[PDB]
Amino acid sequence: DRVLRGSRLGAVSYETDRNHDLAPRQIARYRTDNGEEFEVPFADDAEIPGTWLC
């Protein structure tokens, strides 16, 4: 009677979750006003802005 189709706005890939040869990562640290660290793992080749939303 009523059978439809549809998809969410997004596509799906199919890879392998290797966990060794990842991109080189710099870990950056930010801080709020009330002493709250928020560790931000960036790339190693990445500019670090002085401010960041947490």
């Binding site: 439809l4 189709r5 549809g6 998809s7 969410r8 706005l9």
Partner: protein, 196 residues
Amino acid sequence: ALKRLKVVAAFQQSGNSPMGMVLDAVPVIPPELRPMVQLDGGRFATSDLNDLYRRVINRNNRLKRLIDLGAPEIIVNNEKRMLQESVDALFDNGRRGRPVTGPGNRPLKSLSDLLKGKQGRFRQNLLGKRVDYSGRSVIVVGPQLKLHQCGLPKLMALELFKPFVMKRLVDLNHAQNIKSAKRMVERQRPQVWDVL
């Protein structure tokens, strides 16, 4: 005193605070559980919590704007009252006063109606669920069979045992790859019965 002493002694034995009744930060359900799907044809479907969340967002932002502005208490407390009513309408729509409705005047299905009643995740997905590797047909009498045997039509059993027969007829090199095996099974070439 006894009827109060139930919950009083419960809080006494508990290490839990009695601060749980008030709330400062409503949590947000992840967006896959409230899908923003669209159909082939530009028609968009949501699951009715987005309207309630949007309403609470509007009231909260307006109250924050008024409290940084500095306003008389009639305005501020009316805004607080409608914010409180909005949060109540989010958590259980239809308990107190009137349920918030929308187009067609159906009340909006709140969070609690995803558990309450016969359409929640305690009955409606816990009665039963459809399974794969299934099938059904009509039955006839098989009076030459032994007791542990039963018949099966081939056009059903071929569909039932499809991955097993894919593996076996790759292992006998009738089709060198899985896609070739699938097309051979779909075209129903005569080797599949002796494999089956």
